Design a protein around this ligand. Structure first.
Ligand SMILES: [Mg+2]
Ligand SMILES: [Mg+2]
Ligand SMILES: [Mg+2]
Ligand SMILES: [Mg+2]
Ligand SMILES: [Mg+2]
Ligand SMILES: [Mg+2]
Ligand SMILES: [Mg+2]
Ligand SMILES: [Mg+2]
Ligand SMILES: [Mg+2]
Ligand SMILES: [Mg+2]
Ligand SMILES: [Mg+2]
Ligand SMILES: [Mg+2]
Ligand SMILES: [Mg+2]
Ligand SMILES: [Mg+2]
Ligand SMILES: [Mg+2]
Ligand SMILES: [Mg+2]
Ligand SMILES: [Mg+2]
Ligand SMILES: [Mg+2]
Ligand SMILES: [Mg+2]
Ligand SMILES: [Mg+2]
Ligand SMILES: [Mg+2]
Ligand SMILES: [Mg+2]
Ligand SMILES: [Mg+2]
Ligand SMILES: [Mg+2]
Ligand SMILES: [Mg+2]
Ligand SMILES: [Mg+2]
Ligand SMILES: [Mg+2]
Ligand SMILES: [Mg+2]
Ligand SMILES: [Mg+2]
Ligand SMILES: [Mg+2]
Ligand SMILES: [Mg+2]
Ligand SMILES: [Mg+2]
Ligand SMILES: [Mg+2]
Ligand SMILES: [Zn+2]
Lengths: 135, 50, 60, 122, 86, 52, 134, 105
RNA sequence: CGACUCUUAGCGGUGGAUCACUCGGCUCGUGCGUCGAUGAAGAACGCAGCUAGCUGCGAGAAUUAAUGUGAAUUGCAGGACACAUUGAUCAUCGACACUUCGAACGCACUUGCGGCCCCGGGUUCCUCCCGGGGCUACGCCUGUCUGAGCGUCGCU
RNA sequence: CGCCGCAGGUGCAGAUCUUGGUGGUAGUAGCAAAUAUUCAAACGAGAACUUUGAAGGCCGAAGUGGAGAAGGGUUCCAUGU
RNA sequence: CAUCUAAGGCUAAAUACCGGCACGAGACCGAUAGUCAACAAGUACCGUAAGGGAAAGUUGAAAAGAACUUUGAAGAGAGAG
RNA sequence: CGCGACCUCAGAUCAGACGUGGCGACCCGCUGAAUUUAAGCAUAUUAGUCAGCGGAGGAGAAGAAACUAACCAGGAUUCCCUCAGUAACGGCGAGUGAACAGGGAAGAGCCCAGCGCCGAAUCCCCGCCCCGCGGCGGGGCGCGGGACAUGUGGCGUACGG
């Protein structure tokens, strides 16, 4: 899990926020691995990743990367999408599979938090006061 | 001090060169609105940034 | 006495003076003025008269 | 008396550089006159000679650049300054050919089921 | 004496000019600008100071390239062409 | 900016007001009292041919 | 009235454009009416004022029938200096008095190739207007 | 503090609502923009119907609206099969088709 | 009788209210919706005949070319400028150019010091000194070359 | 600007209110730490204060002397006002 | 019994827009107001630094911006224009 | 006892490319308070908000059901009206609080892996020739390299093929 990075465990505030241990990161370790691969190779695009092993202290994933400027990718349709600018650093905006799993997206009654495309989008729509011209 | 770097000396040179009164023919221009150099700096009153 | 480019060294000043005035110089002393311009004192070779050179340049 | 760019372009590199050298020695003499008092005519000639130097150098550089462009015409690799400089993002995007080429499945679909022009009666 | 007497002993500069951002905030002993964080690749900027952000945002300076970009955008960034000669 | 600049009026009210204004435009006392110099006008409900 | 949604009627904007106009359209702003004889000879009404054409002042202190050649078009101050539109200052030297070109009438035009081209273009546009409105 | 008789009111204004207020001064502009886009689209598909593909007859789901009939998303594959129109040809002649809708009766 | 003090009024000062003005804001709306290793944003230093700031610009430096325009710019001076063997000014801006820091890129900086390859000079080819030009950052993809392994093998 | 309507950032003596200006105090407090000045002349509209000369004094080499570091940045030097 | 077929991928439109480029408008403010900034304003200046941050619009239609005489060393006056 | 093939690694100022930094109003992913309210206060509230970090585009994200429903059934996403201050949550206190159906704006669908068949049918690079330049493509040749059977391309994807 994610230990809260506060000096000497002091989280100055109300007791409900005193937690330091037993805390958890919102994104998965696979998403973190994809993010590290993408940050190292910012000239490539993270496509997906998979699990290849684990230990008591380590997890091992293999991340598929695509060189967006190689001709074998540029000249092939159905892979030209990854070369568009709207797809750079998908793993840092949670657009891969592993990253998307943590956003609460989906269809139906279990996923009402994300109607509108994201939790923040749903929150804005539900917390905006629509002040029409004629009230 | 006497010991100074080239950058410091050049900065002081620019601040020296811009510490002069306005030319008198400026006030004869059309729609001037300028009377005297308000950015004058005296060495004893206002100290430079560096 | 010349006002030269602040980025020019003594070798460059010597060669420039030699080429564009057709004179031979002995040594170049160099300072940078408090206003930022570089000043070069170019001593001429003994067989050249700096007075005559200044007359030809037109700075008498 | 002044020089123009349109009558400089017929001349070759040697006489263009000769013109540039004459203008430069003239400008140096004008600066000497500026520091030794001089006259208003010689002080006003400084800008004219400076613009003439700029004009000659512009013609020289334009001639050289156009010659380089015609030399590198048709070559696979060109110097970066000879390549177009639209915008970094616009240089990063797909060219027209790979922008509009389609898969065999896409073009087979387009052949089999083309969009029809139709109207509906009321 | 914490006041006038102790003011007489300040003669060593903590900060110098910064080669990035040109401010007199380059801590010499830490080798770091306290305004832009120069040895860091990214400019130091915080949303708790909108006034400080607008002191140094884009447009407060010269915009040598961006002015030409804004002008060139109006004609589709055309290049390699000249007006038809007279 | 959210001062409620606009008001909504019932359609029946607005039609009522149009009818009242039209009815009052046919009474010479009311038009004269709006100050419209209808003194040589041959007929206050002044109707002209379609060729206008 | 004005219907074009891209031309402004704002007073501040119009004044700003007028007073910060570049000189090549200050030339348009500083136009003068032609005399009746010139307006009959050429089918034009107005004409930008020019360095070497002669005018009559029709408004102000210097109005009269006297023809005076323009000696200066001071576009920065939106005025023109004419030959005898002048006054003595304190020391006795004579200084030109600038007047607005809208307050003069051009009686003879300084004619050259460009002036003739502008005159015929204006006349042709006026004639196509008349034949459209016939 | 409550004052005499009244209604216990619970306004939802404890949450910095003034930063998220959606004014509607661009509503007439939006109506103009949508109207112009509709006109342009109708011009673009010149003889084709302006509103778009023909939609099927569909009964509203729940017990409150099942006495009412509205337009559906598209014609079902069974409908197209027993009408004799190919499912990939219908969309070119302007018949909307919903591959996920079944026919229960 | 005067001074002095108070009240009021005329005039004069001090002061900058009021009013009138407005090339400024604020608000709403529309259309676009474009930065960067081909070096951005930002910073520094420079650049005008007389120029400190603001503005503009980059050693071609208050601008070159080109196109449109068509006789000015102007505070003073100067000299242009047959307006046709082409033109002041302004606008536009597609050609050319664009100093030093800066992601900032040979190493380093509150200083400075390299290496490699060409060219010119003193040399009078051999490699020292001077100058000019071009390279020399990190990460990473494809390919290339050179390799390493008591890794897995084949042949001898 | 009046009248009929409409709409407000709509009326000040106070808030140790905000900004600006101005009084009495008041020609008042004060210009009193480290011994000290004086005579003549010159320049000059003008001299207790500047310059020269003469005198009397002080710092008294751990200086009120001669030079530097840091810091300042042209204060340096002539000429003029 | 109903309903879908997870753990791979793409996708326009309707939607958002207190930064930017260019516009238009207003029952808004009218120089202590309106942006901090109508003006050489993120300027002068303050702080080691992070940062803080002003004041400041109006001759006249046209400079025609008071020639000349006179007192004074001049500031400043009296005449004249 | 050396020469080869492969595998796994390394170096290069190797040939050609690509990333970095800025802006950040709008958008995506995280992280994340306390003032405040509760007339005290600790759960709660403020608030998944401020501040902090990262990443984009002219929009972004979402998106073609492991859906809603329980009906005579609807049918991707997004936005508006309404549902609704409701169901529900809550020291059941203060307070918080959606969704479905309905009406509209818009409307558009699809592609792989796998299972199979097709003599790898596939792709990149380097040369040479022609047509071109305006973002560098087409056509042709190469006993020219490489990638690739540890799987390229064509048919095909739950609506079946
Ligand atoms: Mg001091
Ligand atoms: Mg030296
Ligand atoms: Mg396929
Ligand atoms: Mg203390
Ligand atoms: Mg220290
Ligand atoms: Mg519709
Ligand atoms: Mg008075
Ligand atoms: Mg030109
Ligand atoms: Mg050192
Ligand atoms: Mg082996
Ligand atoms: Mg009030
Ligand atoms: Mg009061
Ligand atoms: Mg009261
Ligand atoms: Mg006293
Ligand atoms: Mg005393
Ligand atoms: Mg003694
Ligand atoms: Mg001493
Ligand atoms: Mg103000
Ligand atoms: Mg006032
Ligand atoms: Mg005085
Ligand atoms: Mg290389
Ligand atoms: Mg970035
Ligand atoms: Mg409380
Ligand atoms: Mg309380
Ligand atoms: Mg408390
Ligand atoms: Mg709590
Ligand atoms: Mg934030
Ligand atoms: Mg998208
Ligand atoms: Mg998506
Ligand atoms: Mg599906
Ligand atoms: Mg209700
Ligand atoms: Mg909540
Ligand atoms: Mg296959
Ligand atoms: Zn800095």
């Amino acid at each position: 899990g994610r230990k809260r990075p506060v000096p000497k465990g002091a989280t100055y505030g109300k007791p409900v926020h005193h937690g330091v241990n037993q805390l958890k990161f919102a994104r998965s370790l696979q998403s973190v691995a994809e993010e590290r691969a993408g940050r190292h190779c910012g000239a490539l695009r993270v496509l997906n990743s998979y699990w290849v092993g684990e230990d008591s202290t380590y997890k091992f994933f293999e991340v598929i990367l695509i060189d967006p400027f190689h001709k074998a990718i540029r000249r092939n349709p159905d892979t030209q999408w990854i070369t568009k600018p709207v797809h750079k650093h998908r793993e840092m905006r949670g657009l891969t599979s592993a990253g998307r799993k943590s956003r609460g997206l989906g269809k139906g009654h279990k996923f009402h938090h994300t109607i509108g495309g994201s939790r923040r989008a749903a929150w804005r729509r539900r917390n905006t006061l629509q002040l029409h011209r004629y009230r | 001090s006497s010991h100074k770097t080239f950058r410091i000396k050049r900065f002081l040179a620019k601040k020296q060169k811009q510490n002069r009164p306005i030319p008198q023919w400026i006030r004869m221009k059309t729609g001037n609105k300028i009377r005297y150099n308000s950015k004058r700096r005296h060495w004893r009153r206002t100290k430079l940034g560096l | 006495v010349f006002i030269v480019d602040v980025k020019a060294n003594k070798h460059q000043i010597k060669q420039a003076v030699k080429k564009l005035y057709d004179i031979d110089v002995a040594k170049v002393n160099t300072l940078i003025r408090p206003d930022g311009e570089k000043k070069a004192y170019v001593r001429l070779a003994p067989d050249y008269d700096a007075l005559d050179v200044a007359n030809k340049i037109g700075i008498i | 008396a002044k020089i123009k760019a349109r009558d400089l372009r017929g001349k070759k590199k040697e006489e263009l550089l000769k013109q540039l050298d004459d203008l430069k020695v003239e400008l140096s003499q004008l600066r000497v006159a500026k520091v030794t008092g001089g006259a208003a005519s010689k002080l006003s000639k400084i800008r004219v000679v400076r613009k003439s130097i700029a004009r000659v150098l512009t013609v020289i550089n334009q001639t050289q650049k156009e010659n380089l462009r015609k030399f590198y015409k048709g070559k696979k690799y060109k110097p970066l300054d000879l390549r177009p400089k639209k915008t970094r993002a616009m240089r990063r995007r797909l060219n027209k050919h790979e922008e509009n080429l389609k898969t065999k499945k896409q073009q087979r679909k387009e052949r089999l089921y083309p969009l029809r022009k139709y109207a509906v009666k009321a | 004496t914490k006041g006038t007497s102790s003011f007489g002993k300040r003669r060593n500069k903590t900060h110098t000019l910064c080669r990035r951002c040109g401010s007199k905030a380059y801590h010499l002993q830490k080798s770091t600008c306290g305004k832009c964080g120069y040895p860091a690749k990214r400019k130091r900027k915080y949303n708790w100071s909108a006034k400080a952000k607008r002191r140094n945002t884009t447009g407060t300076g010269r915009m040598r390239h961006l002015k030409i970009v804004y002008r060139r955008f109006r004609h589709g960034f055309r290049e390699g062409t000249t007006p038809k000669p007279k | 900016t959210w001062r409620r600049w606009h008001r909504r009026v019932n359609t029946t009210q607005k039609r009522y007001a149009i009818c009242s204004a039209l009815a009052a435009s046919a009474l010479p006392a009311l038009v004269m009292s709006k100050g419209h110099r209808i003194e040589e006008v041959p007929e206050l409900p002044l109707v002209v041919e379609d060729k206008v | 009235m004005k219907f074009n949604p891209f031309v402004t009627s704002d007073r501040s904007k119009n004044r700003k454009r007028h007073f910060n106009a570049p000189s090549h359209i200050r030339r348009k702003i500083m136009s003068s009416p032609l005399s009746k004889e010139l307006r009959q000879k050429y089918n034009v009404r107005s004409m930008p004022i020019r360095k070497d054409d002669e005018v009559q002042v029709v408004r102000g202190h210097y109005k009269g029938q006297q023809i005076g050649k323009v000696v200066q078009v001071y576009r920065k101050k939106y005025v023109i200096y004419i030959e005898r539109v002048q006054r003595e200052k304190a020391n006795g030297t004579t200084v030109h008095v600038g007047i607005h070109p809208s307050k003069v009438v051009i009686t003879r035009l300084k004619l050259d190739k460009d002036r003739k081209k502008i005159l015929e273009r204006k006349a042709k546009s006026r004639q196509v207007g008349k034949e459209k409105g016939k | 503090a409550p004052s005499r008789n009244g209604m216990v009111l619970k306004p939802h204004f404890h949450k910095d609502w003034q930063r998220r207020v959606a004014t509607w001064f661009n509503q007439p502009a939006r109506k103009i923009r949508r109207r112009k886009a509709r006109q342009a689209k109708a011009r673009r598909i010149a003889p084709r119907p302006a509103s778009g593909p023909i939609r099927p007859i569909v009964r509203c789901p729940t017990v409150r609206y099942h006495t009412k009939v509205r337009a559906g998303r598209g014609f079902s594959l069974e409908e197209l099969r027993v009408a004799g129109i190919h499912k990939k040809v219908a969309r070119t002649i302007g018949i909307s088709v919903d591959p996920r809708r079944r026919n229960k009766s």
